[PDB]
From Swiss-Prot:
Cofactor(s) of this protein: FAD
Quaternary assembly: Homotetramer.
Organism listed in the record: Enterococcus faecalis (strain ATCC 700802 / V583)
Binding site for FAD: G7, S8, S9, H10, G11, E32, S42, S110, P111, G112, A113, R132, D281, A299
Enzyme Commission no: 1.11.1.1
Upper lineage: Bacteria, Bacillati, Bacillota, Bacilli, Lactobacillales
Recorded superkingdom: Bacteria
Name of the protein in question: NADH peroxidase
Family matches, as Pfam families: Pyr_redox_2, Pyr_redox_dim
Free-text remark on how the cofactor is bound: Binds 1 FAD per subunit.
Chemical reaction(s) catalysed: H2O2 + NADH + H(+) = NAD(+) + 2 H2O
Amino acid sequence: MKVIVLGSSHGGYEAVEELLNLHPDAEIQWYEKGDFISFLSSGMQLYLEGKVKDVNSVRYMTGEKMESRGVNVFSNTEITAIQPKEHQVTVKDLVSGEERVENYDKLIISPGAVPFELDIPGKDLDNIYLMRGRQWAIKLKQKTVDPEVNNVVVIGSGYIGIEAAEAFAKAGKKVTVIDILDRPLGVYLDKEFTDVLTEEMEANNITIATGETVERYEGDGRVQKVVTDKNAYDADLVVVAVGVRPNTAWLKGTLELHPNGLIKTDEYMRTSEPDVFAVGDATLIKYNPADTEVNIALATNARKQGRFAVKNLEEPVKPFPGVQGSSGLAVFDYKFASTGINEVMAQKLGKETKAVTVVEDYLMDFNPDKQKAWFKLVYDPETTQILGAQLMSKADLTANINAISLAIQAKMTIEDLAYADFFFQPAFDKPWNIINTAALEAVKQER
Ligand SMILES: Cc1cc2nc3c(=O)[nH]c(=O)nc-3n(C[C@H](O)[C@H](O)[C@H](O)COP(=O)(O)OP(=O)(O)OC[C@H]3O[C@@H](n4cnc5c(N)ncnc54)[C@H](O)[C@@H]3O)c2cc1C
């Protein structure tokens, strides 16, 4: 049984791991069009801030290690087309230009996504950079110490844009973040959280320009200005972090795709064609808070889907359990985490919700280490089932969001969480901990 896996990033990598422990006998080929196997773009911020010195260590697998396990690794080799009925792919060795056709019994593809670019005048003056992969990581890092870079503009105020803004602010640059949306990180956090984070970023000389549409880049050879409908900003470097496009144009006509380019798959990771499975950023995933399919481009999702594709390789026997969209990040001193439905998600899905927010010290009064914490619990108005939660503090309390992720999956209610058994010891929390306290508030709001 010969299985070909496309892609060495999170989705493709975990498919290879699950093949090794479920089908040790199989002939496994692993293809990567790039030069470097399994670079962790999630670790790029630690490298840009100087926490990690060696860019080549920001990875989780090497071709050498997988070959020791009997996998055939082909780096610098691109799968150019799939011929699904005859079960063949044509591959191109990018160093020699050779093209050959390869047959498979089963094919798992995790083609991923590419950074979205602004197709505007000035489009590629020098020093308009993107943020994905090893080559961009290295170029961004060289700019961090360049004395000619004084002003950097990042377009996009989502997760990746704020990571870039923090990294260049810490390198001593002046940073402006521009976006059409009215709040940074709105996809992850509601207004009472992003108001605090905006103040924190502005204290560290990041200007946030919201509600503005970028119209063109101006400069002579290299960028010098970014002009929006409302303003013109000086820029020595631009980081475009607007979003991501599925890497699927080459699949048009071969596999069924959604209007937005995402690959259609069912709950067993099967595509429209026999024996080809698709995983990761290029697909939709079962979203349990709202019982629907949503594109949630996270490494956690791609890894779980990669293993479930291998579980359903011979028979559709194991439907995907679904996810809650859990995410977490530190922005200067604040560490936040969120899961499930928040205001932007509810708007997009047309879902009605209720919520309580508690802001108080997470340790008892007499303990001098006490610090404020913000917690918001979102629940269904009819059933009072838990639909989401967001938490933030300068203290690290983020592991508590893992309990809310499970509560949503288990369809627990505000009353279940109000009296759930969480430990107490006064160096760590209060007799009713942060989750108990917000659920107790919600029980009062519904009485
Ligand atoms: C800056 C940054 C920070 C992030 N931080 C986090 C985080 O902290 N936590 C988290 O959960 N997620 C994070 N993510 C998201 C996460 O990295 C992605 O969700 C995940 O990498 C998706 O994996 P994938 O396999 O679907 O695709 P991709 O990572 O896009 O990889 C696809 C791979 O397949 C290769 N390929 C594509 N086409 C072909 C082909 N035709 N032939 C051969 N090879 C091909 C590509 O070269 C690429 O290596 C972050 C992403 C970025 C960019």
